[PDB]
Design a protein around this nucleic acid. Structure first.
Lengths: 123, 88, 129, 6
RNA sequence: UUAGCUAGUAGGUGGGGUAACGGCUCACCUAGGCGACGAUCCCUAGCUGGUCUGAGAGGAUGACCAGCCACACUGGAACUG
RNA sequence: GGCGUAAAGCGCACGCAGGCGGUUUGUUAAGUCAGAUGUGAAAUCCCCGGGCUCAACCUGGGAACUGCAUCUGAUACUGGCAAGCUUGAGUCUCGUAGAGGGGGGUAGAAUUCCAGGUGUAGCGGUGAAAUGCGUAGAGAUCUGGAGGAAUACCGGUGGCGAAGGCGGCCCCCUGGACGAAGACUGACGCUCAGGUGCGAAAGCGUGGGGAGCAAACAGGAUUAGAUACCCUGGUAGUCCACGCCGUAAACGAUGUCGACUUGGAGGUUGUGCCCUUGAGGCGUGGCUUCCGGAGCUAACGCGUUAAGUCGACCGCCUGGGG
């Protein structure tokens, strides 16, 4: 409102909160992967979404989504998580990178293989 | 408020001349007189918070009154204070 | 409260021409006249009048044209709550120029367009459109 | 119109 | 959701000291000195030139390059010059 | 950028620091302003060129580095100093209305209770009922006493206060407001973080008080249940004293202060005028409803008692949930 007021208690910015805080605010992280489960999403949709509870490197343990039809993951493994949430499964704020570390890319995927990690099959 | 016969005399003394109910040294003398007088009221009662509030209006105003006098003329400020006995 | 007599002019005037009147009066103040003069000279009001002796009174003869008045708008810039002063080049120009902006200078009041060429500068009283 | 909570 | 902080503390005088002024040191003496324009206390952090973004006012940042600073196993000290 | 309802005006008031401040002259020159001089490394960005084939890169020159200090000027505005003026503010006088407040009396009506007379079996209650209450005689009715509480009618989108909130009549102490011809003072003001004070009901503490009502509690019904609604009771409480508590949809859900901007119809309380020849006839204040122009508004609406057009200071908001 008033200048005098702004002069006194000055206007204060409101910091932002990284939707993904699996620390360092850094590209991706390595994690041991505690369990490999499958769950059900919100009311509108109904699948058997695949997920894994991963013990990151920085100590935070967190649940991550496994994108693509099928995966090699299980018990131990060592995926590397990324970012981007999964608006359908709450709590799932991270996606494990496919075809990274102990994670196998989606078998046979031919479209947009950059994700789901796969290599050009016989050009 | 305060007996007309009372208020008058007051005006004379401090006010340069009769009818000079405008000079600062007057309101103060007047205000004081009233205040001092109101003490005995609230002395008992104490619950008449409403009258108290009006009282406060006087106590306050006088201060700001004394503060004006001082600012533009220290002499009359002191002189007045003493002859009235306060402003500790 | 009385705190600001200048924004009382601009307001009374902006309000007067609002209620399509021809004359608006207010107590007189030296600076007020200075401004009055400005508006006249710049053709924003037919003219001033000051028939005040003991209690200075100021009247302003309002102008008009077609389906509107002369002053499309008038705002107070520098106020007692936040004074604004400007250099020679920092002087503000109203409506790409089509409109004065009263600036007081150490050598008597002026208009943005005036003071500009004048070479100096100073506090800017207001914005008239 | 509205999902996951509304 | 830190409000009070300080005795060499603040000043004086007087010896000593330093390359030099100086509480730097000591002795004596007044009793002060800082603080809500935020001291003190916590947390964080190398500072500037600039860098990124923005129409701009600003917001963010200070890797590479240059100026200033600081440290060189941790803590402390002097010596040489 | 916002806050009547969307998130948002502190429940209200006083006021220290601070912010802001009517008007006229002189002066000051700090703020402010113009010229000058130092300085503001280089590089980078930028403007015009040059060179690697181009470009990136490299480079010449220039502008810029919006800043600071010193000096010589300026004087409107702002600040200080000096001396006034009065439209702000305040003082006195004379009236005016008022559930304003504190304290103390008292009146009448009424409920309940008790004593006593008459007087008979019923009363009370509901949608219907039952519990309850009566033949140690209720209810009813008559006389009188006690006690507490509140005070019909008047009473009115009346009035008073800062708000919370205040209504029988009377005394005592007291606050404020409004008008009018005036007298005086002289800008002594506006605002207010923190501070301080006031602050509905409920509630707490120590006591008193206790009729009616009435959380909890009993019983009676109703219901599938009915730990409610309805009924018969009934404690705390409601009242008082002195503390404490400090909360409400403390709402106009709309901070306070000042100025400006068409009207219409009331209510209310003043006042000046004119055969007052009318119960009134024409004016000029304060408080206060309503309707509604422009304008504002997202709309609803607000609308000279603005959510209009300005200004000073304050407080407050910054997605839902958590």
């Amino acid at each position: 409102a008033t200048v005098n007021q702004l002069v006194r208690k000055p206007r204060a910015r409101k910091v932002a909160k990284s939707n993904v805080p699996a620390l360092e605010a850094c590209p991706q992280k390595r994690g041991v992967c505690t369990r490999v489960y499958t769950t059900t999403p919100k009311k509108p949709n109904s699948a058997l979404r695949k997920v894994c509870r991963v013990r990151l490197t920085n100590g935070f343990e967190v649940t991550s989504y496994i994108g693509g039809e099928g995966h090699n993951l299980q018990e131990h493994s060592v995926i590397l998580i990324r970012g981007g949430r999964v608006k359908d499964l709450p709590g799932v704020r991270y996606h494990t990178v496919r075809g990274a570390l102990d994670c196998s890319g989606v078998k046979d995927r031919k479209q947009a293989r950059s994700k789901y990690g796969v290599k050009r099959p016989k050009a | 408020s305060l007996s007309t016969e009372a208020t008058a005399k007051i005006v004379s003394e401090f006010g340069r001349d009769a009818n000079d109910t405008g000079s600062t040294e007057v309101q103060v003398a007047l205000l004081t007189a009233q205040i001092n007088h109101l003490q005995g009221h609230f002395a008992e009662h104490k619950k008449d918070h409403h009258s108290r509030r009006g009282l406060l209006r006087m106590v306050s105003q006088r201060r700001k009154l004394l503060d004006y006098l001082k600012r533009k003329d220290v002499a009359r400020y002191t002189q007045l204070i003493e002859r009235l006995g306060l402003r500790r | 409260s009385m705190q600001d007599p200048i924004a009382d002019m601009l307001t009374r005037i902006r309000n007067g021409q609002a209620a399509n009147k021809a004359a608006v009066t207010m107590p007189s103040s030296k600076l007020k006249v200075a401004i009055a003069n400005v508006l006249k000279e710049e053709g924003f009001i037919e003219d001033f009048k000051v028939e005040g002796d003991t209690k200075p009174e100021l009247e302003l003869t309002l102008k008009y044209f077609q389906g509107k008045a002369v002053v499309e708008s008038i705002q107070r810039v520098s106020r007692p709550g936040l004074r604004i002063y400007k250099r020679k080049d920092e002087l503000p120009k109203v409506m790409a120029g089509l409109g004065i902006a009263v600036v007081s200078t150490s050598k008597g009041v002026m208009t943005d367009r005036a003071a500009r060429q004048a070479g100096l500068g100073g506090e800017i009283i207001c914005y008239v459109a | 119109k509205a999902s996951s909570x509304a």
